[PDB]
Every structure is written in C-alpha cells, then in structure tokens.
Amino acid sequence: RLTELREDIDAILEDPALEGAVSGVVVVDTATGEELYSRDGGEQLLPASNMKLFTAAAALEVLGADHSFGTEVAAESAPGRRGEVQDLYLVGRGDPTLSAEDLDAMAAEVAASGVRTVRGDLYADDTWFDSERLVDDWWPEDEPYAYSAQISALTVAHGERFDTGVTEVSVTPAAEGEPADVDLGAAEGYAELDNRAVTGAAGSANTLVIDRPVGTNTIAVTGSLPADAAPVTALRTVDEPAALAGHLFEEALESNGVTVKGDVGLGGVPADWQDAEVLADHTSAELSEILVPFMKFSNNGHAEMLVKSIGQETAGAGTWDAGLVGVEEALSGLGVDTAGLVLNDGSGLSRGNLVTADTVVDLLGQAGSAPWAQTWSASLPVAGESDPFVGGTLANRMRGTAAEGVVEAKTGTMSGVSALSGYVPGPEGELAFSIVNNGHSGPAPLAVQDAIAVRLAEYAGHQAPE
C-alpha cells in the first residue's frame, strides 16, 4: 500500500511539464511523524505565495488570534461652542481591512463630536509603519497591479476581499470614434487621468490597456474598446495609499456636514501636541477573521502589513527588517527548524525568498498542534469548493476528485515558480505535504500538483464526490 504510493508519485513526477525543473516533494503522516515520501526535501527553492504560510503562523504567534487593528481621528483639542478645530489627523495603525464605509462612519463621529469646520489642514498619518513602500527586489513593471500595491499603515481596502492601496478603474464604450469613458473610482480627484482610449466599431478587437506609468500617479489608458463591449473593470494601484485615504476622508467629512478649509497631505501628529483629542475611531475585525480573505485569496498587502505589525509588536518598529526577524523568531519558538529559510518578504512576491519542502512540512506539523490550529486551518483554500470564500485559489481545481472538500492547502505561482502545500485529513491521520517546483519553462504544473494531492486523498481513504 505504501510502496504503491511511492511508485505513483514517482510516475507523476516524470511528467514533461517538469522538464529541467527542480521539485521539492515531501509527505508526512502527522499522527506518527512517518515520512511517506521525500524527494529533494532539503533543497532550497523559491516558495512564491507559499511564503504566506510562514507569515500567517508567525502573526498568530506574535499578535494572537484575538488581535485587532485601530484607526483614529485626532485634533489638538476638542471643538468649541463654535465647533471649530484647526488641523485634523487621520491616523492609521495597520488595519488591512479598512473600507470607504469605515471612513464615512468615522466622519459621522467627527460631526457627532461637535466639529463643523476644519479650519486648518487634513493630514494622513501612516507613521506607525515606515515609508518603505515596496520591497527592494520587487519588479517595477508589476507596480500597477493590485498584488504589488504600496505598503502603508494607513490604506483603504477595496471590496469584500479587502484589496488594499488600489482604485477600481471602469472603462465604458461610447459611440464608435468617441473616446472611451474612464471612471477612476475612489482615486477620482486623487490620481491623474491620461485617457487616450477610443471606442472602436461594434465587433472590433478589444485592445484596451490600463496602466500606471512607473513613478507617477497617472492612470494611463490606451487602445480601443468595441462599441458593443461590456464595460471593463480593473484594480490599479495608486501612489501613496495614505494620501488616497486622506482624500476619501475629506470627502466623507464633507458628506457628513464637515467643511474642510485647508489642504490634504501626509503628516504625523506633532510631538508638541500635549493631549490629543481623539474625535473618532474604528476597530477592525480580529486577526482570526482577517486570516480568511488574506489566505484564501493570497493577499500580498495583508501579508506585508502583518510583517510590519509583527515588527511593531516585537520591537516598536513597523519595518521589514524587524518584522522578518520577528517572523523567524516566532517560527523558531514554535519548534520549526529555520536553517533553510531565507525571508525577504511576507507575501512571497520577492524572488529573494527561499524555503525547503522539509521546512514547509515541519511548519505544517507545528502549526497543526498549536493552540490556534483551527483558526489557521480554516483560512486555507479547500480543494474544489465553489464558494470563493471557502475554495479560494483552489475553487476551480480538483473538483470531482477525492481531494474535493478534503484537501486544505496554500497555493503559489509566479513565472518559473509554483507551489502547493497543506493537509489531507484521513480516516487514519492528518497527512501534511509540500510540493515546490522551480525552473519549469511552460505553464505552472498545476495538474501535476493536483494529481499528487488527489493520490494522497485516495491513500488517506477518500473517494470523489459524484
């Protein structure tokens, strides 16, 4: 029975999709510590988004499942009979799920607190983290796209997935030959618009491109949208998420009857402020709930923000240097051997990250017996589950196989790198596996990863739902 499995995995790994690739594959029975399968287990490889496994476990160690995140609004003193204040500060302390609606609710509080007029300026304070927006070795060409959003302590999260530091651009065709209509979403009045796009004939080819040119705050739109096309939406990053948050907050104040007379910019609450008056605040959901959209959809912004929150909690430093040491120390304190680990970010976007499949499985075992094991487990994509908040990045993989509804695993893919690691619960014991592939030259070997996870599900005693 055990010899069949090794033969079957051996054969799966001969697939031509893995030509010239190195593949770390480890499978362990977690009830006994029995190594069921091991190849290139100690080989150092890029993890891509499997890096998030390390980040999530450390966040739960350092911050706790009950940890929540605060945002507040501050003036030098409370408002008067006249209901006036001078400068106002919106202060972000690392909430990765702060919505436009949370801004409106804080704006209503400011009004309710007696403010009618902000006579001075509105400043967006993100000083709880440092102002290092991107990791050194991240690629500049990626910057326009949600997964490369700038990192800040104060950022507005979009939608129920809470994509941070982005705006939703919507392009709608007009009559043929008329410019396409571009709607910048939340960044209206914040980001600049360079719209060169036209509406093409009905049935013409869609060549529409939406860019943010490197080192600018301009949404540049080119190409041609067919007159008969459905409108196109895309998430695009902005420069300085905190200043977009400031912009949206100004609007929310105005919309709740509070007149802002001055300008909007970045700035930290002055040191010379004696006893700041907190005029409004907001508390995020607890980390256990935040772990769901973070890990199910592999949210890079959430990961980096949790690293810096780790740096804040361990060292008073909202920094990658500090946060990444904190991740490593949390993992060690958990009993994980971190010798094979090189940590350059929390999300796994960085090509400077390294793991080994053995280190991954080690972590899977330690996390499985931690006090927070269930919270952690619930955050992982579940093979083949059609509800996006349940199936996550595995929603349309492994359907109608023994893995469906059973395998819980984290994904990860970029150019030349793909990974799948997690658990296979069986009638007998929970299996832990890690599959890390580097160096394949075609599509990410997802079918190969599926075949192994499916084989493990079967071995554990499972059968495909019909």
- Which parts are annotated binding residues for substrate? 410
**Residue with structure tokens 């979403």?**
185
**DSSP-assigned states of every residue in 278-303:** EEEEEEPPPHHHHHHHHHHHT-HHHH
What are the strands, taking DSSP E only, across 242-380? Answer: 259-260, 264-266, 277-283
- 147 binds ligand IM2 per the rule CB under 6 A: yes
- 135 binds ligand IM2 per the rule CB under 6 A: no
Among 24, 318, 348, 384, binds ligand IM2 (CB under 6 A): 348
Helices vs. strands in the chain: H and E counts, helices first: 11, 23
Catalytic residue, chosen from 52, 148, 224, 421, is 52
Whose Cβ is closer to Mg ion: residue 231's or residue 465's? Answer: 465
Contact 155, 165 (CB under 8 A): yes
Applying CB under 6 A, what is the total number of residues that bind ligand IM2?
A: 13
The 266-305 contact track toward ligand IM2, x by CB under 6 A, reads --------------------------------x-x-----
Among 178, 188, 321, 387, binds Mg ion (CB under 5 A): 188
Q: Is 288 a catalytic residue?
A: no
**Residue with structure tokens 């990626």?**
142
CB count within 10 Å of CB 289 equals 16
Catalytic residue, chosen from 23, 152, 224, 298, is 298
Whose Cβ is closer to ligand IM2: residue 71's or residue 300's? Answer: 300
From the list ligand IM2, Mg ion, none, which binds 41 (C-beta under 5 to 8 Å, kind-based)? none
- 393 binds ligand IM2 per the rule CB under 6 A: yes
Stretch in the footprint of ligand IM2 (CB under 6 A) among 8-16, 18-26, 276-284, 411-419: 411-419
Whose Cβ is closer to ligand IM2: residue 246's or residue 384's? Answer: 384
Among 46, 48, 244, 457, binds ligand IM2 (CB under 6 A): 48
Q: Is 170 a catalytic residue?
A: no
Q: How far is it, in rounded angstroms, from Cα 40 to Cα 45? A: 10
Among 220, 260, 406, 424, binds Mg ion (CB under 5 A): 406
Whose Cβ is closer to Mg ion: residue 257's or residue 335's? Answer: 257
Query: Could you give the strand order of the β-sheet that contains 122-125, starting from the edge strand earlier in sequence?
Result: 264-266, 122-125, 88-92, 70-75, 277-283
Whose Cβ is closer to ligand IM2: residue 118's or residue 146's? Answer: 146
From the list Mg ion, ligand IM2, none, which binds 298 (C-beta under 5 to 8 Å, kind-based)? ligand IM2
Q: Where are the alpha helices (DSSP H) in 171-286?
A: 241-255
CB 79 to Mg ion: min, Å: 25
Query: Which token pair is 82?
Result: 């006249």
Applying CB under 5 A, what is the total number of residues that bind Mg ion?
A: 5
Contact 465, 44 (CB under 8 A): no
- 19 binds Mg ion per the rule CB under 5 A: no
- 244 binds Mg ion per the rule CB under 5 A: no
From the list Mg ion, ligand IM2, none, which binds 48 (C-beta under 5 to 8 Å, kind-based)? ligand IM2
From the list ligand IM2, Mg ion, none, which binds 411 (C-beta under 5 to 8 Å, kind-based)? ligand IM2
Spatial neighbors of 61 by CB under 8 A, at least 6 apart, are 330, 331, 333, 334, 370
Helix (H, G, I), strand (E, B) or coil at 423: strand
Spatial neighbors of 255 by CB under 8 A, at least 6 apart, are 104, 107
From the list ligand IM2, Mg ion, none, which binds 413 (C-beta under 5 to 8 Å, kind-based)? ligand IM2
Q: Which residue is nearest to ligand IM2 (CB)?
A: 49
Phi, psi of 195, deg, nearest 5: -100, 105
Q: How far is it, in rounded angstroms, from Cα 85 to Cα 116? A: 8
Identify the sign of the CA torsion 452, 376, 349, 232: positive
Whose Cβ is closer to ligand IM2: residue 145's or residue 273's? Answer: 145
Q: What CA–CA distances, in Å, run from 230 to 170, 195, 253?
A: 11, 18, 34
Which residues make up each annotated binding site? Answer: 410
CB 419 to ligand IM2: min, Å: 7
Among 49, 71, 224, 314, binds ligand IM2 (CB under 6 A): 49
Whose Cβ is closer to Mg ion: residue 69's or residue 459's? Answer: 459
Contact 154, 73 (CB under 8 A): no
Query: Which token pair is 189?
Result: 């009045």
Whose Cβ is closer to ligand IM2: residue 124's or residue 380's? Answer: 380
Stretch in the footprint of ligand IM2 (CB under 6 A) among 25-33, 124-132, 314-322, 408-416: 408-416
Q: What is the DSSP letter of 398?
A: S
Q: Is 52 a catalytic residue?
A: yes
Residue of 380, 455, 444, 370 whose CA lies nearest to 23 = 444
- 349 binds ligand IM2 per the rule CB under 6 A: yes
Q: Which residues are catalytic?
A: 49, 52, 298
Q: Under the rule (CB under 6 A), what is the footprint of ligand IM2?
A: 48-49, 147, 298, 300, 347-349, 393, 411-414
